[PDB]
Structure 1
Amino acid sequence: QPMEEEEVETFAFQAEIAQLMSLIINTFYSNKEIFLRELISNSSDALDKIRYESLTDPSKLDSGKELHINLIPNKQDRTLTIVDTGIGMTKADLINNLGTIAKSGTKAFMEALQAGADISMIGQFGVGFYSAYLVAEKVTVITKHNDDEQYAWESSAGGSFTVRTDTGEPMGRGTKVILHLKEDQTEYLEERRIKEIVKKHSQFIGYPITLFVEK
């Protein structure tokens, strides 16, 4: 094929977010399983946003009426994908919300964690997404909002992330978080383990979850 050209935007994480990511990555924490509760909570919040906004404007569901979460472990590529049909993010929302803008709870959470707080407290500080780095060496976030095109965000930490127009499979609306798991964290690809953690932490979320198991 003749050479194709793709635009990439590389961003630096806000200094404190980068400090938090390094703390989560480079330090042992027990109870890493809470990463799933945090991502399912973000999906649930996104599904509430489109649900309430569609009450006033039902055409916001032209990109899909079904409001749900799918969990997709892939043992071949060692990824766990969390997909929702929530509100999604515009490119601007994605750049702002996933690393460039200082988050209110970052400083406070780092002090709490170092003082011996369990990693489980992360969600209360509004930085729960970053718990993905307890189990993943790389995270890819694919998102589609009614007001913009589909975008792919990705980071292996190291203080930067990239954003590009997604060349992958289009989604009607919502967000897909792809966790590229660390070699020692493959238990999160096991259906019994995923079911255990969803029953323990994610029972009252408001939307149906479906776990897709590879035969």
Structure 2
Amino acid sequence: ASETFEFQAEITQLMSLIINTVYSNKEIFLRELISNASDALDKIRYKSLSDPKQLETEPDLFIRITPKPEQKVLEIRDSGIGMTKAELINNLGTIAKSGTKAFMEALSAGADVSMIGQFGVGFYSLFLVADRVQVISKSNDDEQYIWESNAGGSFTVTLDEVNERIGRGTILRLFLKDDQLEYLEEKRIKEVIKRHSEFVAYPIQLVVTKEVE
């Protein structure tokens, strides 16, 4: 029925630094979320070694990118390990994150945004291209939940009685900024993926809507 949570202070700062920022190489947000997806797919594949039944909820391991042009939305789905309510809460904003400080200090010094991934806060690069995100997620150990943020000071978390059922995993639902609609285009997606996500152990799927004529 949907709870509101406060962002740890530094995490709010990080998000502002990013959402309010010029910078050409915004395309990196795609490497970052594909990198996350991949990590999440590794984790369930590995968990499944001693627990084969964990795969039963969704046998197929993939990454799938669905531009929804109509809604100015882009979605990155993975059939990875997914995240519980508690995980969404703790890992995505309430708890003091590993390198949020360190990363901003590095930016102060002239570091390239590109590095965000190496500080373990790559997730937040999605604010380069988006003013709202929903992380929708289904872990084998909990119900499906939606974490939502507009880069403000808080996020909500809501039991998901609204989205298609993910069997297991996570959909990143990016509400793209108006200047950033190029990331809805098939050719632009293939380009970024080919150039900067060359070594991914899982198939990357791209959902394309074509009018039959």
Range of TM-score over shorter length: over 0.9
CA distance in 1, matches of 2:110, 2:190: 28
CA distance in 2, matches of 1:53, 1:156: 33
Of 169, 180, 195, which residue of structure 2 is paired with 1:200? 195
**Structure 1 partner of 2:103:** 109
CA distance in 2, matches of 1:56, 1:100: 31
1:176-191, aligned counterparts within 5 Å? 176-191=171-186
**Structure 2 partner of 1:10:** 4
Q: Give the SS at the match of 2:131.
A: strand
CA distance in 2, matches of 1:201, 1:102: 29
**Structure 2 partner of 1:43:** 37
The alpha carbon displacement at 1:41 in A equals 0.5
1:125-180 deviations in Å (ceiling 9; x for gaps):
00000000000010001000001000000000111100000112111000000000
Structure 2 residue runs without a partner (length 5+)? none
Q: Give the SS at the match of 1:212.
A: strand
CA distance in 1, matches of 2:82, 2:200: 18
**Structure 1 partner of 2:127:** 133
CA distance in 2, matches of 1:153, 1:179: 12
The alpha carbon displacement at 1:114 in A equals 2.1
1:36-115, aligned counterparts within 5 Å? 36-115=30-109
Amino acid at match of 1:19: Q
Structure 1 residue runs without a partner (length 5+)? 1-6
Aligned length: 209
CA distance in 1, matches of 2:20, 2:62: 34
**Structure 2 partner of 1:152:** 146
Amino acid at match of 1:194: I
Of 3, 19, 25, which residue of structure 2 is paired with 1:31? 25
CA distance in 2, matches of 1:209, 1:47: 12
Q: State TM-score, norm by structure 1.
A: 0.96
Q: Give the SS at the match of 1:179.
A: strand
The alpha carbon displacement at 1:28 in A equals 1.3
1:179-198 deviations in Å (ceiling 9; x for gaps):
00000000000111100000
1:23-50 deviations in Å (ceiling 9; x for gaps):
0011212200000000001000000011
Amino acid at match of 2:168: R
CA distance in 2, matches of 1:140, 1:46: 17
1:56-87 deviations in Å (ceiling 9; x for gaps):
11111110110000000011001110001000
CA distance in 1, matches of 2:92, 2:160: 16
Moved more, 193-202 or 25-34: 25-34
Moved over 4 A (4+): none
What CA RMSD, in Å, does the superposition of the two structures yield over aligned residues?
0.7
